[PDB]
Design an enzyme around this catalytic site. Sequence first.
Site, PDB file in Angstrom:
ATOM      1  N   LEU A 195       0.823  -1.196   0.000  1.00 45.72           N
ATOM      2  CA  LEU A 195       0.000   0.000   0.000  1.00 45.72           C
ATOM      3  C   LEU A 195       0.862   1.253   0.000  1.00 45.72           C
ATOM      4  O   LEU A 195       2.053   1.228   0.313  1.00 45.72           O
ATOM      5  CB  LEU A 195      -0.940   0.013   1.204  1.00 45.72           C
ATOM      6  CG  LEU A 195      -2.010  -1.073   1.190  1.00 45.72           C
ATOM      7  CD1 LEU A 195      -2.755  -1.090   2.496  1.00 45.72           C
ATOM      8  CD2 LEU A 195      -2.963  -0.845   0.040  1.00 45.72           C
ATOM      9  N   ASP A 196       0.230   2.355  -0.367  1.00 49.74           N
ATOM     10  CA  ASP A 196       0.857   3.660  -0.443  1.00 49.74           C
ATOM     11  C   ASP A 196       0.822   4.315   0.937  1.00 49.74           C
ATOM     12  O   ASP A 196       0.165   3.833   1.861  1.00 49.74           O
ATOM     13  CB  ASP A 196       0.121   4.503  -1.490  1.00 49.74           C
ATOM     14  CG  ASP A 196       0.921   5.685  -1.969  1.00 49.74           C
ATOM     15  OD1 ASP A 196       2.060   5.865  -1.498  1.00 49.74           O
ATOM     16  OD2 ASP A 196       0.403   6.439  -2.814  1.00 49.74           O
ATOM     17  N   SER A 197       1.555   5.418   1.085  1.00 49.22           N
ATOM     18  CA  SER A 197       1.456   6.189   2.319  1.00 49.22           C
ATOM     19  C   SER A 197       0.136   6.944   2.404  1.00 49.22           C
ATOM     20  O   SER A 197      -0.379   7.164   3.510  1.00 49.22           O
ATOM     21  CB  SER A 197       2.647   7.138   2.436  1.00 49.22           C
ATOM     22  OG  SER A 197       2.718   8.022   1.337  1.00 49.22           O
TER      23      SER A 197
END
Lengths: 171, 128, 100, 177, 459, 87, 40
Positions: free
Chosen positions: F41-43
């Site tokens: 996942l992304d930040s």
Amino acid sequence: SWDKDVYPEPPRRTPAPSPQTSLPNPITYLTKAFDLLVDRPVTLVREFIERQHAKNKYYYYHREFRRVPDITECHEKDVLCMFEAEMQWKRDYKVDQEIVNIIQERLKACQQREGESHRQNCAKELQQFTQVVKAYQDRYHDLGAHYSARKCLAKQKQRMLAERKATKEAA
Amino acid sequence: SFPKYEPSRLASLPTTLDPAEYDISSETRKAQAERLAIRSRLKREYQLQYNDPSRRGVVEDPALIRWTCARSANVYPNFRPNTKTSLLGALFGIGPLIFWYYVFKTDRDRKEKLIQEGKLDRTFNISY
Amino acid sequence: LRWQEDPEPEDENLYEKNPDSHGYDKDPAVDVWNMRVVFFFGFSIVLVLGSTFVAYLPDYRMQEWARREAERLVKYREAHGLPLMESNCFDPSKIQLPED
Amino acid sequence: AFLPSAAYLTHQQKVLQLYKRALRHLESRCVHRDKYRYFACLLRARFDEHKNEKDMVKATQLLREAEKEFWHGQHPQPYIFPESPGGTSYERYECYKVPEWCLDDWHPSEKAMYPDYFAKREQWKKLRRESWEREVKQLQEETPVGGPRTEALPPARKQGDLPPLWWHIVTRPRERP
Amino acid sequence: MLKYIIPTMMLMPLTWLSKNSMIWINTTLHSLLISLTSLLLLNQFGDNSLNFSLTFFSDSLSTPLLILTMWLLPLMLMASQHHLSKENLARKKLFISMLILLQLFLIMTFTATELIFFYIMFEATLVPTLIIITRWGNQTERLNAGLYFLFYTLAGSLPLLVALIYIQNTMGSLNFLILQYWVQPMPNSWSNTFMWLACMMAFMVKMPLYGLHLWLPKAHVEAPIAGSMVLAAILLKLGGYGMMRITLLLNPITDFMAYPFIMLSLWGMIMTSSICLRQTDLKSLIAYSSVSHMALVIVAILIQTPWSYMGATALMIAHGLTSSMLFCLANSNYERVHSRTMILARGLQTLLPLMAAWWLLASLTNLALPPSINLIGELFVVMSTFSWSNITIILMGLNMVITALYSLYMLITTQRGKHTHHINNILPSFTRENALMSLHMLPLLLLSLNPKIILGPLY
Amino acid sequence: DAPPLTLEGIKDRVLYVLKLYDKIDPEKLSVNSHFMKDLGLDSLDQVEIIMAMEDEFGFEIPDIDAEKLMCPQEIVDYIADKKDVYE
Amino acid sequence: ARQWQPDVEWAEQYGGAVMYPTKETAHWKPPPWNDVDPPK
Ligand SMILES: CCCCCCCCCCCCCCCCCC(=O)OC[C@H](COP(=O)([O-])OC[C@H](O)COP(=O)([O-])OC[C@H](COC(=O)CCCCCCCCCCCCCCCCC)OC(=O)CCCCCCCCCCCCCCCCC)OC(=O)CCCCCCCCCCCCCCCCC
Ligand SMILES: CCCCCCCCCCCCCCCCCC(=O)OC[C@H](COP(=O)([O-])OCC[N+](C)(C)C)OC(=O)CCCCCCCCCCCCCCCCC
Ligand SMILES: CCCCCCCCCCCCCCCCCC(=O)OC[C@H](COP(=O)([O-])OCC[N+](C)(C)C)OC(=O)CCCCCCCCCCCCCCCCC
């Protein structure tokens, strides 16, 4: 009780109860309940205490001060005469204060008693109030915290000189 | 475009709208790290005393003592009478005294003249 | 270095040696009797009996008398048609004015 | 700007804090959940457009005009969680958060009302006073010269030691005392 | 008056012959008995004062000041016995001797029939107060405080002495009873102008007048607790008592000599109350509040109406009780945290709830909550100053805003908010401390039931 | 009013909100699934996960704490510490 | 927290030749303790 002349009241005219409805009002039942449950035990306790007062009756008195010479017939810086004049003046000032209080109590009692037609029916108490406040103001106002019979006499002599000058210039 | 935020004395500039918040220069990193070092040293010095079991009392803060000494006792040793302190001490010290003197004096002269000329309504005034 | 000085004595807790302390003294019997002296002679004696004394002062500065005397004078001069108060405190017959 | 461990915020942290503030203010503007959900996906699409930006001057410029964008478009009364700072229930229970040392000042008649509690309190106090000197000498053998750089504290390194400066973290009052 | 003077002097062998563990108990007991005895002075008459002898008399002005003075000595002993527990025994007895000697000088200051004997007792009060401040005060500044307290007084009071002796040469007497009947009007002249200043400025310093007040936030702050109690509760009121006696002789020149001082008081109560909003020292805040409250007593005595004298004596008694209680509350926090900084120990209602109730009641009486005698005196002075000039209500009403604001701020800072984490020596309230607060606050609230005994000679 | 939280209840609710998230398959998810290293996942996705945790449990996680919660177990431990569970 | 008593710095202000040393009275030393000067 009290004296009904110094604290006057007009005669009370209550109307007779003329019920138009068939519903019984709760006020008569609560009045009968207050007469039975409250007023009779309070009356019996007071009759007991009144019998205990009547077993030992004793009296107190209203103190009568005779009139001593006032400040006008005291020699200047004569402390023995002007002391008594000053004490007489202080007692008369305290009594005049309570006379103004009596007339104010009459005025306020008339305003509550006459109710919504108080303005027409309390003209006599208002007039007596105006007269006694004018007299109290001419006698004692603006003397200061260090008032005396000398300050009051000087105020009266100033007022009498003003009245004499106004009478002289108008003739 | 957008209305620029105009900061005031009682409404400061936001942190996110300040241009110096986005400085990535090494001297600002040194200043921020040195402030973090001072704050971490004071933090450690505080909480070594705060967490001490034998301590029972007040952890004295010399910053608080220093503030309360500056607010009271250091003021007159650092006062110099000059143009600014004299013109502020006389404007705010005797200015309002002259102002309220003339206000109350004018009011009482006017009221005394009305009373001695019989014009002031003093009909039920017997308490004073 | 600086001179020969006693260090700061630590602040004493009266509840440590005497958890029933009233805070008057470290001796518990002296502490309890100081408490009893303060409470009996302060509350039981001065406050209660002093408020009872002030409550029953014999007509403090003749106010009640002054009402009753006023109730005499009004009743004398309502009936005799006199005004309730004169503007003159002193009889104008016994005053000489400076003539002009 | 002001952080206990770090001396500053990085650019990535500034972008993420802007993204969270913008979504919370967008939820305040956009009360209903489907309408917020639509515009939150649009705002995520605006944040994903400049995500793979390698020029840090260009990225800092985009962040700065995005902060101007946020400051124009913020809600005047954003939603604040009730125990959150500025909330309606924030620091409400602080009047009930009596510190533990007050139990040392209890009378013996009211300590006798809770015998097992105070018997269990005394072994916490004993544990704390035998851990104190070991954790002080842990801190002074691990802090560099000139003082600590950050406010981060070390853990316990041995089996039997407690973490240094632990008592007011562990024995803090409950949020609902 | 000698039925009070002799037991007050017998407190001296009582403290010096007591056993070492009994010197607080015995002096507290017998000073409470003297205070119970002091109610016989309430034989007051509507016309005459209670005139005991050639030397002593007591009207309704001096009588509540006497009862408050004789009441304050047991409370000062209770307030002072804890912080003097480690003291040497002979110095402890010397402290109690200075308090006894100060009571002795005060009770014949207020009953002195003749004005130069009033002057000598009035100035005799300086020496025990100076000794108490400079010997048993806690800090360095007490020494400087002892100088200011000494030299603002004497520089004001040595022209009074000359002035009084001049009256002795002019009237032939300084008996106040003779001067009630032999007072001559004081006309407008420069000689009578400086006569007025010499008669008034010593009491202006004692009140204190604003601008002359600078000795007070050093003398009341650097004093020990009994020193601050007697300074705020009694010794400020020597100035008001002395003005109420001396303005008999100063008419009609007072009617324009009062104008600057009234301004100094009416603006001064705006200033010093505002100063209380930014005080960091709690005991300094209580001191500046005393300056602000005594400004009303100055205005009320200078406008010299019946309502103003009644309000001024009610406000003097009420301020005596309230300011003495506030100094005792601030001392009860000082004897735990050992600092007078008000922002230091916060959230104290979470730790000390009954003492927080005492803080609440003393703050409510400080802001003149009706029907307290604080409000009775406050309100009656406001009525008389409105009659003096209708514009004064502005400076009156604004004062009552600021008086509320610093009273509750003091209550919000010390009692409310979060407690200070690192302060862990907040002991539960001793029975002596709550007793001291109740012996201030319960008579203060009971005087609202019957305030006519504190309304002075022209009630 | 105000039912008490348990560690199992907090864990169930955290994993429930993460199973209702379309970028996480619910069969790969566990309590120790790192969002960036395991879930990919992304930040921004991590910020949205913490905001959904805030909406779930009704309190705010600050950003200095939110940036460090990189698995469900760290979120459960944070909510446990801020709500004093298992008294 | 105990009572302040004068230190050496407070007490040395009372040991000078005068109380307020000016430029003129700065070469003045205090007199001898037994008030005896050496015969030179
Ligand atoms: C001559 C006989 C006289 C008999 C009648 C008495 C007349 C009054 C005397 C003085 C009474 C004060 C005593 C209580 C307060 C001080 C102690 C205290 O706080 O205790 C708490 C404690 C109960 O609390 P707790 O839960 O255990 O612990 C407290 C908590 O820590 C936390 O505490 P808290 O904050 O939750 O609770 C404190 C609370 C806090 O509440 C407030 O602060 C709010 C008050 C202000 C707003 C409401 C009132 C406004 C004004 C209306 C009332 C006056 C006029 C009414 C008439 C009609 C209108 C004209 O205060 C009260 O509830 C006290 C009620 C009475 C308040 C009086 C006004 C004080 C306000 C400031 C001055 C105002 C003007 C003066 C009024 C004087 C009237 C006579 O009370 C006691 O244990 C009482 C002990 C015994 C008291 C005896 C009182 C008389 C002493 C005189 C002895 C000599 C004569 C013999 C008479 C004996 C009669 C039995
Ligand atoms: C005094 C100057 C120096 C100041 C410091 C002095 C300290 C030394 C202490 C010495 C002793 C005490 C002296 C002062 C005494 C004052 C008390 C006193 O005498 O009172 C006399 C007052 C005088 O009242 P009175 O004037 O009506 O008395 C009538 C006179 N006789 C009795 C002769 C017929 O006594 C009373 O009021 C007694 C009546 C009962 C008491 C009041 C009950 C109601 C109180 C409030 C109830 C709740 C109402 C609603 C509020 C709800 C909650 C907030
Ligand atoms: C606290 C600091 C301030 C303190 C202020 C104290 C008061 C200020 C005014 C004091 C004036 C001096 C005493 C006046 C006594 C009045 C007696 C009298 O009969 O007066 C009429 C007499 C009149 O003289 P006579 O009465 O003999 O004459 C007969 C009457 N006639 C006039 C009709 C012929 O006044 C004087 O003789 C002079 C009065 C003024 C004196 C001027 C010198 C002193 C100046 C003020 C010094 C104030 C203190 C300075 C120190 C400050 C601090 C370090």
